[PDB]
Automatic annotation (TrEMBL), chain A:
Protein source organism: Bombyx mori cytoplasmic polyhedrosis virus
Residues of the full protein shown: 1088 to 1136 of 1333
Name of the protein in question: VP1
Ranges in a coiled coil: none
Amino acid sequence: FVPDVPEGYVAVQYAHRLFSSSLANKRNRVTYTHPPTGMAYPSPTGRPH
Amino acid sequence: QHVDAESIMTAPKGKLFHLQFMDGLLRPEPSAFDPPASGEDMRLIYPLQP
Amino acid sequence: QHVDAESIMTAPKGKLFHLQFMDGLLRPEPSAFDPPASGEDMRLIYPLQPISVARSMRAIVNHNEVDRPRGAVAPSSYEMDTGTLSRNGDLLYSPVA
């Protein structure tokens, strides 16, 4: 049973670059970087799908 | 010590249990160059007084 | 070990003594809220060459928030080039054009 990708998603190609390590709050965290908009989202949650 | 997320829903009405809250303004911050550690931490019960 | 500021002025001309220099780019920085400690530190003998010629690259760590950590050297573009040998010639680089 192949669960089809939901209605509205942004398909990003995985790179060895878009995941960067930067400071957020008081600690060091692994951060995503959205290719089309160029953003942070340091939290493991709250990142755009 | 910490209250359980089940004893705060199915306990007698009369009971008075105490919680424990954090302050962290004098918390030691991370270093300059460092490999980031994994994991994050949760808060389940907040006050509303204040 | 360290040279004395008197043995560097009244010693035989032929002698070859070695010094010791510091790097400190990966030095641990101070904390946030802290009572400052007293005292300061001196440098009396500097070079004028400049030294450090055999230095391929440096500081192999990525910075806390910014990209390049100040004085950081990347590998030379020639330490990574295999050129085919000629029949008489032996080692030559790539065409580049």
